[PDB]
mmCIF file of C-alpha atoms in Angstrom:
data_model
loop_
_atom_site.group_PDB
_atom_site.id
_atom_site.type_symbol
_atom_site.label_atom_id
_atom_site.label_comp_id
_atom_site.label_asym_id
_atom_site.label_seq_id
_atom_site.Cartn_x
_atom_site.Cartn_y
_atom_site.Cartn_z
ATOM 1 C CA UNK A 1 -0.984 36.467 2.801
ATOM 2 C CA UNK A 2 -2.805 33.746 4.899
ATOM 3 C CA UNK A 3 -1.651 30.179 4.050
ATOM 4 C CA UNK A 4 -3.750 28.443 1.355
ATOM 5 C CA UNK A 5 -4.433 24.787 0.447
ATOM 6 C CA UNK A 6 -4.407 22.862 -2.884
ATOM 7 C CA UNK A 7 -6.907 23.863 -5.610
ATOM 8 C CA UNK A 8 -4.606 25.340 -8.320
ATOM 9 C CA UNK A 9 -6.223 25.898 -11.759
ATOM 10 C CA UNK A 10 -6.793 22.491 -13.430
ATOM 11 C CA UNK A 11 -8.682 21.506 -16.665
ATOM 12 C CA UNK A 12 -10.875 24.659 -16.755
ATOM 13 C CA UNK A 13 -10.534 25.834 -20.401
ATOM 14 C CA UNK A 14 -10.656 22.183 -21.645
ATOM 15 C CA UNK A 15 -13.867 20.253 -22.420
ATOM 16 C CA UNK A 16 -13.460 18.586 -18.972
ATOM 17 C CA UNK A 17 -13.200 14.903 -19.971
ATOM 18 C CA UNK A 18 -15.488 12.655 -17.868
ATOM 19 C CA UNK A 19 -14.752 8.996 -16.985
ATOM 20 C CA UNK A 20 -17.868 7.343 -15.491
ATOM 21 C CA UNK A 21 -17.331 3.676 -16.492
ATOM 22 C CA UNK A 22 -14.402 4.093 -18.958
ATOM 23 C CA UNK A 23 -11.205 1.994 -18.712
ATOM 24 C CA UNK A 24 -7.577 2.517 -19.855
ATOM 25 C CA UNK A 25 -4.796 0.056 -20.840
ATOM 26 C CA UNK A 26 -0.957 0.106 -20.971
ATOM 27 C CA UNK A 27 1.847 -1.751 -22.826
ATOM 28 C CA UNK A 28 2.495 -4.277 -20.014
ATOM 29 C CA UNK A 29 -0.433 -6.703 -19.520
ATOM 30 C CA UNK A 30 -2.304 -4.851 -16.732
ATOM 31 C CA UNK A 31 -5.814 -5.515 -15.335
ATOM 32 C CA UNK A 32 -8.329 -3.082 -13.762
ATOM 33 C CA UNK A 33 -8.158 -4.348 -10.114
#
């Protein structure tokens, strides 16, 4: 009934991947800031 805000179910049944100091790359030559 009362309006709600974001918070829909997300990765809950998954292992919950954690990225502390990890980095990702793409096809185009991209740099991490």
